[PDB]
Amino acid sequence: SQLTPRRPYLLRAFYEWLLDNQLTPHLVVDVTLPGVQVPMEYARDGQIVLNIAPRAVGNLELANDEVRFNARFGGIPRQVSVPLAAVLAIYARENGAGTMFEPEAAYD
């Protein structure tokens, strides 16, 4: 039958590459979806950009089901959880290099 979703492997892929080019990894998420764990106030137009470069995050986790890590908003340490379903894109802050994720049935 149909295989498991690809997004997570490609995500981790681009992640490692943007860092082998010094660039800084930024994640775009859809907050209008279930399972999303972030300070909603920091979002805008049903979205939110998160910095996931090594130095700006703690205990980053790029699992196939979700993205987990700690970070600070305004300085308050806070946990974050993003369903791979709502991970819209990954890109570099410096020169926008990266990729937008293609739709897959696994994520409806």
Partner: peptide, 8 residues
Amino acid sequence: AANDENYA
């Protein structure tokens, strides 16, 4: 981004 540059 929404979060700060350093989790230091």
